[PDB]
TrEMBL record:
The protein's name in its UniProt record: Glycoside hydrolase family 57 N-terminal domain-containing protein
Keywords on record: Carbohydrate metabolism
Residue stretches making up the Glycoside hydrolase family 57 N-terminal domain: 6-397
Lineage: Bacteria, Pseudomonadati, Aquificota, Aquificia, Aquificales
One Pfam family this sequence matches: Glyco_hydro_57
SUPFAM superfamilies referenced in this protein's UniProt entry, alphabetically: Glycoside hydrolase/deacetylase
Family: Belongs to the glycosyl hydrolase 57 family.
């Protein structure tokens, strides 16, 4: 009797590229590409396990633009320049960015504490601030290769900074290749999401929000987004086809969001399997185990992720010692293994790039200990998505209906329902009436609504600038 374990790491960034200037207004795609997007699948070169990944098409687009050297990244140009060439605004942007990341474990360099406690910084000190911001986002592979510059910790030269930058772009240029390789070798499956990561159930039917939050206010949806919902899915299939030469058979619905209509659309578009959240299962079926493969109306296969285990990695284990975290994780899998007579399928689904910066050493001790332990546990078999989809020796169940929701409390309140988020929907609804190009799809991405009307921290104004720019461009 085995326990089947399925890791599914979701990778996404909204489009940071301003449509009129072409400038990347935030550097997050760059930093998560050099730190996480290559290195998470690159663990498969050192550990004989299966790991699966989701890549949104919008993220793939930006990775390609950086690998081709066409990405005009405003924050990165402030990093690359000789400090004597920096504009006063670029120095402020560099300091603000450091301050935003200052308490993250990956930013624990003593030299950073010194620089941020100085009244003014000379050229030598700015070069360290530039280079240490680069090095704090160093991924596992180059952490081994650049160890001597990393342990230097201070006194960086322009030449050393440009060397690091060169190695980072080498990593980005190999990123889509590593996904093709692990896919070809059978080390994992690769999925995508509808193109700009929208909330498909809302696009299809905005009233589905009342299935879980009857008291919420939503704007007057005076146009139909149903066709744009088909578009996100179709163009995502095209983009995945471009990269991997095959149409995607698995999809990760953005924010785990499903509804009866969304599942029908995924089915009509040829999708054979997706996953969603455990809260959706419990809202939809009176008594239901998340360790079975589910068939929605015998149309499409659905797995419901293990919310606890997914949340443990995504939010808890950063605060633990690495060995104890893995002992806890393994112990829970042993309890699942012993508690059922059949072979349970356990789905661990979370973002693949956002939790590691809060772990010691960028999550590397945790993941190396976790993956080394998993690979030696006889009774655990990690599975590609394809294997989990086609696995014969598992338990299965048909379900006929789901209550619409997301993995945020099983509802849509992260993206609609307050004055500020509803204003974005009003802006999109009016813009959709006058839309003339696919920038209307960019504006339908979940991220713009996620950040809206939530507390004001640095650079969240940039998301508002991007959303409104895409909405304006969509009408020209
Ligand atoms: O002050 C309080 C605030 O402080 C901190 O937040 C800071 C950050 O520290 C700072 O670095 C910066 O954040 C940056 C970020 O660093 C950049 O990378 C970028 O963020 C990107 C991100 O990298 C992308 O992956 C993408 O995020 C999507 C994501 O792909 C998508 O899957 C989804 O994921 C979230 C989901 O919506 C949430 O509900 C939740 O999901 C959990 C559920 O909550 C839970 O219930 C569980 O069961 O399951 C779910 C999954 O595990 O979290 C998910 C996060 O993965 O949505 C996100 C967002 O759309 O895109 C974003 C960009 O949109 O940019 C940001 C912004 O600059 O700035 C912030 C604020 O200053 C602290 O970390 C944070 O906790 C505090 O709120």
């Amino acid at each position: 009797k085995k326990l089947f374990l399925v890791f599914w790491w979701h990778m996404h960034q909204p489009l940071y590229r301003e449509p009129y200037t072409g400038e990347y207004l935030l550097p997050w795609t760059f930093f998560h590409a050099v730190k996480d997007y290559y290195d998470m699948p690159a663990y498969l070169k050192d550990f004989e396990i299966k790991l699966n990944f989701n890549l949104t098409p919008v993220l793939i687009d930006q990775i390609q633009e950086y690998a081709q050297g066409k990405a005009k990244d405003v924050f990165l140009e402030a990093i690359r320049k000789d400090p004597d060439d920096l504009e006063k605004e670029e120095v402020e942007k560099l300091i603000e960015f450091t301050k935003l990341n200052y308490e993250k474990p990956i930013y624990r360099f003593e030299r950073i504490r010194e620089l941020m406690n100085k009244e003014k910084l000379n050229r030598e000190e700015l070069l360290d601030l530039q280079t240490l911001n680069l090095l704090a986002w160093c991924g596992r592979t180059l952490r081994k290769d650049l160890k001597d510059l990393l342990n230097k910790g201070r006194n960086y030269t322009q030449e050393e900074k440009e060397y690091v930058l060169n190695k980072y772009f080498e990593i980005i240029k190999k990123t889509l290749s590593i996904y093709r390789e692990i896919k070809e070798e059978g080390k994992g499956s690769v999925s995508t999401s509808p193109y700009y990561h929208p909330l498909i159930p809302i696009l299809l039917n905005p009233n589905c929000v009342y299935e879980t939050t009857p008291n919420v206010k939503i704007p007057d949806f005076a146009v139909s987004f149903r066709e744009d919902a088909s578009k996100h899915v179709e163009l995502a299939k095209e983009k995945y086809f471009e990269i991997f030469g095959e149409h995607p058979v698995y999809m990760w619905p953005p924010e785990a969001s499903v509804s009866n209509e969304a599942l029908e659309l995924y089915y009509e578009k040829g999708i054979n399997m997706l996953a969603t959240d455990e809260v959706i299962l419990k809202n939809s079926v009176e008594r239901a185990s998340p360790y079975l493969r589910y068939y929605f109306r015998e149309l499409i296969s659905v797995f419901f992720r293990d919310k606890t285990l997914s949340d443990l990695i995504g939010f808890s284990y950063h605060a633990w010692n690495a060995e104890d975290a893995v002992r806890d994780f393994i112990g829970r899998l042993k309890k699942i293994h012993e508690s059922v007579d059949f072979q349970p399928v356990v789905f661990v689904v979370l973002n693949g790039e956002n939790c590691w910066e809060y772990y010691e050493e960028n999550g590397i001790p945790f993941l190396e200990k976790l993956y080394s332990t998993l690979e030696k546990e006889e009774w655990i078999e990690t599975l590609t998505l394809e294997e989990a989809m086609r696995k014969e020796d598992v338990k299965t169940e048909v379900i006929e209906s789901v209550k619409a929701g997301t993995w945020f409390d099983g509802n849509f309140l992260k993206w609609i329902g307050n004055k500020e988020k509803n204003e974005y929907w009003k802006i999109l609804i009016e813009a959709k009436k006058k839309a003339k190009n696919d920038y209307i799809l960019v504006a339908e991405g979940s991220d713009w609504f996620w950040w809206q009307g939530e507390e004001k921290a640095p650079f969240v104004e940039v998301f508002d600038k991007l959303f409104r720019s895409f909405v304006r461009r969509a009408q020209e």
